[PDB]
Amino acid sequence: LMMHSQKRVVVLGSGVIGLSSALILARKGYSVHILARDLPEDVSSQTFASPWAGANWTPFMTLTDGPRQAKWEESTFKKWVELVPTGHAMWLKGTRRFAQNEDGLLGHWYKDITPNYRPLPSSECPPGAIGVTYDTLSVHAPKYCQYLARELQKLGATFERRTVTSLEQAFDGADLVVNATGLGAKSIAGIDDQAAEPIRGQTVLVKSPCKRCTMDSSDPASPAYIIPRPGGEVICGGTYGVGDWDLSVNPETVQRILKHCLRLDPTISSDGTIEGIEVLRHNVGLRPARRGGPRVEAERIVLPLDRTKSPLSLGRGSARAAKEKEVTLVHAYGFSSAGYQQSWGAAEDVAQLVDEAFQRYHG
Amino acid sequence: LMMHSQKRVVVLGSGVIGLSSALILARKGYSVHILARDLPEDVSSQTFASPWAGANWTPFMTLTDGPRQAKWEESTFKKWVELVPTGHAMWLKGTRRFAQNEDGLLGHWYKDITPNYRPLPSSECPPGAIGVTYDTLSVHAPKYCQYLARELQKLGATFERRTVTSLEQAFDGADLVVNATGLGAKSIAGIDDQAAEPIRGQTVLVKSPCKRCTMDSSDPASPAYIIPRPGGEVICGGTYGVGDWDLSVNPETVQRILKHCLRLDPTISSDGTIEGIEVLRHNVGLRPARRGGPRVEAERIVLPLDRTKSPLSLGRGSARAAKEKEVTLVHAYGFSSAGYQQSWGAAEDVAQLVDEAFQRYHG
Numbered sequence: 001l002m003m004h005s006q007k008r009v010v011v012l013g014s015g016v017i018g019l020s021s022a023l024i025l026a027r028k029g030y031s032v033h034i035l036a037r038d039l040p041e042d043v044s045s046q047t048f049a050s051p052w053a054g055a056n057w058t059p060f061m062t063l064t065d066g067p068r069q070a071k072w073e074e075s076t077f078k079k080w081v082e083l084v085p086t087g088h089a090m091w092l093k094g095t096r097r098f099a100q101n102e103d104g105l106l107g108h109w110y111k112d113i114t115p116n117y118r119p120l121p122s123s124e125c126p127p128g129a130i131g132v133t134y135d136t137l138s139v140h141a142p143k144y145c146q147y148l149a150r151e152l153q154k155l156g157a158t159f160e161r162r163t164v165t166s167l168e169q170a171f172d173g174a175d176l177v178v179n180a181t182g183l184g185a186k187s188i189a190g191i192d193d194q195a196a197e198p199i200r201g202q203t204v205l206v207k208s209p210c211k212r213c214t215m216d217s218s219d220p221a222s223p224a225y226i227i228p229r230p231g232g233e234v235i236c237g238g239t240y241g242v243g244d245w246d247l248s249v250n251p252e253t254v255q256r257i258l259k260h261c262l263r264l265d266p267t268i269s270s271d272g273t274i275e276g277i278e279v280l281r282h283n284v285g286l287r288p289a290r291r292g293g294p295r296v297e298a299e300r301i302v303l304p305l306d307r308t309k310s311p312l313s314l315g316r317g318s319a320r321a322a323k324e325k326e327v328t329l330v331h332a333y334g335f336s337s338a339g340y341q342q343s344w345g346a347a348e349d350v351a352q353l354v355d356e357a358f359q360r361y362h363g
Numbered sequence: 364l365m366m367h368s369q370k371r372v373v374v375l376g377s378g379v380i381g382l383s384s385a386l387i388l389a390r391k392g393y394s395v396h397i398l399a400r401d402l403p404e405d406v407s408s409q410t411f412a413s414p415w416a417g418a419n420w421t422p423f424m425t426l427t428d429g430p431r432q433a434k435w436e437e438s439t440f441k442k443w444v445e446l447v448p449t450g451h452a453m454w455l456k457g458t459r460r461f462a463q464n465e466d467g468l469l470g471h472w473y474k475d476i477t478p479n480y481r482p483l484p485s486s487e488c489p490p491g492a493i494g495v496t497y498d499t500l501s502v503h504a505p506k507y508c509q510y511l512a513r514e515l516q517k518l519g520a521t522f523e524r525r526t527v528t529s530l531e532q533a534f535d536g537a538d539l540v541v542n543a544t545g546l547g548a549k550s551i552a553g554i555d556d557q558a559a560e561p562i563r564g565q566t567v568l569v570k571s572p573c574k575r576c577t578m579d580s581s582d583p584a585s586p587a588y589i590i591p592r593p594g595g596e597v598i599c600g601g602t603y604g605v606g607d608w609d610l611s612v613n614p615e616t617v618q619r620i621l622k623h624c625l626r627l628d629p630t631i632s633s634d635g636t637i638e639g640i641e642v643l644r645h646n647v648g649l650r651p652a653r654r655g656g657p658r659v660e661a662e663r664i665v666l667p668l669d670r671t672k673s674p675l676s677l678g679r680g681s682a683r684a685a686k687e688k689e690v691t692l693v694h695a696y697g698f699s700s701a702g703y704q705q706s707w708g709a710a711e712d713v714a715q716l717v718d719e720a721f722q723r724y725h726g
């Protein structure tokens with residue numbers, strides 16, 4: 001007769017959001033099991049977003065447009081500062097950010113967070129653009145997820161590969177599931193979120209000692225960015241193909257990205273020429289976005305699902321009776337281009353929801 | 364001092380085409396190593412097509428339009444007949460095929476191959492349509508690939524998971540590679556085939572004793588098919604989304620498919636109603652097609668690649684000298700909706716090409 005945990009949770013999804021959520025929950029003493037198709041070792045899988053990120057910290061919204069986003073970003077920045085001494089985050093000093101106009105600078109909301117925030121002279125901006133410079137942070141996206149997974153291991157979390165098609169498959173040994181499935185949220189019966197949408201991102205991974213980050217959104221015909229990451233590599237971007245699921249490498253996009261990035265910073269090349277850029281890999285990832293913005297909220301759901309709850313429910317459309325339980329589903333998906341920079345704060349909110357659901361529904 | 368094989372080949376890709384090609388090569392005494400991202404155990408992976416097929420034998424082209432296709436289909440039918448006694452293929456007796464008009468029946472070219480080929484009365488066709496009936500064959504797509512893999516094991520072939528980005532990575536221990544990468548052919552440096560394109564196929568897998576196959580192309584607004592497969596299941600289709608990469612399940616498509624299939628054959632349901640259909644799974648696969656049709660041909664290529672051979676070549680665009688070898692690349696991809704039904708014959712042609720390249724270039 002052993003005393004068993006009464007704090008079992010399943011985290012569905014093992015991208016940066018599921019991992020982060022799982023880790024804060026494990027630290028809170030929950031017994032966490034992670035079910036996911038794609039795990040942190042899957043560093044070249046295109047069926048999730050987390051391998052493909054820069055990943056730096058670049059707010060995309062004003063406070064009014066994205067209040068949660070800013071909260072989550074501010075918390076995550078603090079966490080990443082803490083990870084610098086052990087090398088899991090890296091300073092991007094004198095990052096340059098260009099926008100089409102003052103509006104594009106988002107009210108400078110984050111100017112107390114990123115050190116050394118100041119306007120750039122126009123001489124230091126692309127023609128016609130406006131700019132600021134500041135010190136921000138980046139992580140090595142796949143290695144960051146792997147770091148989180150090691151931390152999870154130590155805290156007793158376990159992992160299992162599984163591809164779920166219906167919610168009851170996730171409610172396996174737990175009455176609460178954290179739904180961190182990115183794009184998968186659309187096709188799991190019981191979630192069925194039609195608002196989930198990819199935003200396609202093509203990049204070039206380059207071998208370069210360049211330590212300068214440049215984020216250029218000043219040309220609406222050509223998104224571009226240069227994001228150094230721990231390890232002597234830089235990610236050159238990019239694209240924002242809303243609703244585009246295409247996983248193939250576009251060769252014209254390669255040329256556009258490298259030419260633009262070279263304009264922004266010739267030192268990504270050995271000799272300031274395209275031909276001098278040491279290409280390591282051509283990448284395409286699908287950012288997991290959601291119309292209406294990220295979904296971070298707790299839902300109460302009765303199982304088994306019926307065809308009235310979900311067009312994708314399994315079995316015959318005639319459903320009832322056998323057996324019925326009510327469970328908690330805590331959503332955490334749709335972070336689009338900002339999943340890493342929001343991850344820790346989002347995970348904090350997820351963990352608060354789990355605590356509250358446990359109080360209300362799970363003893 | 365052992366006598367080593369001088370007949371090493373690598374097969375890049377482990378869908379039905381790579382497996383089939385590998386098997387005929389292994390039977391011919393080649394030492395085959397298969398490199399692929401997706402292997403036969405990966406029965407729910409959307410990053411290759413082979414898990415998702417019916418898979419039956421339904422010619423799609425006239426002889427003039429598709430001479431190779433017909434050759435390959437006729438050979439594969441013979442192979443599948445041979446697999447009936449051991450249950451790896453199954454007869455679909457009295458299959459019904461509907462088309463918009465006589466042209467859609469493709470000159471009835473295959474009428475000596477499928478037993479009991481005859482026209483259907485209009486009373487037995489959807490309104491306004493034309494039809495034929497015949498006996499054809501199907502295989503259980505994932506299990507068929509697994510069968511091929513067991514056969515390969517016995518013949519000494521080996522498997523390795525790898526995701527290649529540049530050809531030199533495939534020319535690993537062999538001077539000849541069979542390129543059977545489906546959609547991946549577009550993004551591998553040294554292949555770079557812009558003509559590769561997905562054709563998206565959504566299906567519903569249903570639990571039903573229905574043993575009748577119905578192929579309906581008589582409604583251009585609603586492709587539909589019912590394909591029984593070994594094991595008491597039927598695949599209900601479908602879609603042909605050319606250029607569509609969307610991996611998510613469309614709920615409207617579910618309704619359209621099931622309603623149409625039910626019109627075609629109520630016995631896919633327990634009670635002839637939608638609500639009586641026992642749904643097992645909602646599936647989306649991307650058929651690996653190619654503008655210009657399937658590519659089955661041998662190419663001679665110099666390694667290392669340079670940026671002049673490939674926009675996606677790795678390293679700096681300034682390339683030369685170090686070291687240079689010429690190798691053989693035997694293409695086998697772009698089979699679209701007919702990869703299973705063409706597989707054995709296509710593999711025969713691939714093996715002939717390998718034999719010929721070995722004579723000409725490899726001693």
Ligand SMILES: Cc1cc2nc3c(=O)[nH]c(=O)nc-3n(C[C@H](O)[C@H](O)[C@H](O)COP(=O)(O)OP(=O)(O)OC[C@H]3O[C@@H](n4cnc5c(N)ncnc54)[C@H](O)[C@@H]3O)c2cc1C
Pocket residue numbers: 012013014015016017018035036037038039047048049050051052053054055056057162163164165180181182183184185188200201202203227237238284285286287288332333334335336337338339340341342
């Ligand atoms: C080119 C590119 C650049 C980026 N740069 C940055 C950056 O600088 N900063 C930033 O903050 N972000 C950046 N992002 C965004 C970031 O990659 C994402 O927002 C983030 O990875 C989302 O994490 P997630 O955990 O929500 O989703 P994912 O990483 O997509 O993980 C979803 C998880 O759910 C699993 N799953 C899905 N469906 C099922 C199922 N049915 N059954 C079981 N498991 C399932 C997946 O397999 C996987 O484990 C970039 C993304 C890209 C493509």
Ligand SMILES: Cc1cc2nc3c(=O)[nH]c(=O)nc-3n(C[C@H](O)[C@H](O)[C@H](O)COP(=O)(O)OP(=O)(O)OC[C@H]3O[C@@H](n4cnc5c(N)ncnc54)[C@H](O)[C@@H]3O)c2cc1C
Pocket residue numbers: 375376377378379380381398399400401402410411412413414415416417418419420525526527528543544545546547548551563564565566590600601647648649650651695696697698699700701702703704705
């Ligand atoms: C809904 C649906 C229904 C179908 N019904 C039928 C049917 O009834 N009859 C029929 O004949 N066909 C049918 N098909 C078509 C059939 O599924 C395909 O044509 C066939 O599976 C193609 O096989 P393949 O080996 O060429 O490609 P794939 O199965 O796509 O395999 C490509 C292989 O290459 C690997 N690869 C790709 N890129 C890389 C890389 N960079 N590095 C390493 N490996 C890589 C893949 O991982 C995988 O091993 C259907 C398909 C679908 C979606």
